[PDB]
Design a protein around this ligand. Structure first.
Ligand SMILES: CC(=O)N[C@@H]1[C@@H](O)[C@H](O[C@@H]2O[C@H](CO)[C@@H](O[C@@H]3O[C@H](CO)[C@@H](O)[C@H](O)[C@H]3NC(C)=O)[C@H](O)[C@H]2NC(C)=O)[C@@H](CO)O[C@@H]1O
Length: 129
């Protein structure tokens, strides 16, 4: 599914992402936009044999099993395929796990690049949340 910006903002807010591990909602909408353009079906293969999956582009080297990644740890304990559904439940539960590591939201390259230190007001403007 390709989510609408406010539609995504509502589903994240409803799922307890606003303030999760100290990351306000606009952080999460900004990284989703830059990482996947809001598409739950987005996939991107890396040089290292790993692949990024879903709206949050979670990486297969550490977080999910895609059965073709060398040295994979599957910390979320899931199949990467579960990260591509229109339903965000599993993706959200795994992104919540990812942010608890030491690097926090800095785990996401797109956040570091386009959201960190930025004015993110625009990502939730007009959503009424
Ligand atoms: C920039 C790139 O070529 N790939 C982007 C990629 O880095 C992103 O996946 C990020 O990969 C890094 C590197 O493997 C992951 O960070 C590691 O996470 C472990 C779990 O917390 C730590 O123990 C390691 O210390 C740490 N390595 C480093 C060197 O910081 C990061 O977890 C990961 N992120 C996600 C999200 O799955 C993905 C997403 O930005 O896309 C690109 O491939």
């Amino acid at each position: 599914k390709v989510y609408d910006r406010c539609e995504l903002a509502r589903a994240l807010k409803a799922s307890g992402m606003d303030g999760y591990a100290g990351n306000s909602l606009p952080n999460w909408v900004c990284l989703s936009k830059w990482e996947s353009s809001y598409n739950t079906q987005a996939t991107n293969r890396n040089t290292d044999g790993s692949t990024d999956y879903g709206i949050f582009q979670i990486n297969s080297r550490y977080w999910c099993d895609d059965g073709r990644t060398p040295g994979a740890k599957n910390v979320c304990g899931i199949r990467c395929s579960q990260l591509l559904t229109d339903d965000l439940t599993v993706a959200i539960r795994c992104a919540k796990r990812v942010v608890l590591d030491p690097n926090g939201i800095g785990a996401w390259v797109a956040w570091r690049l386009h959201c960190q230190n930025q004015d993110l007001r625009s990502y939730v403007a007009g959503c009424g949340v």
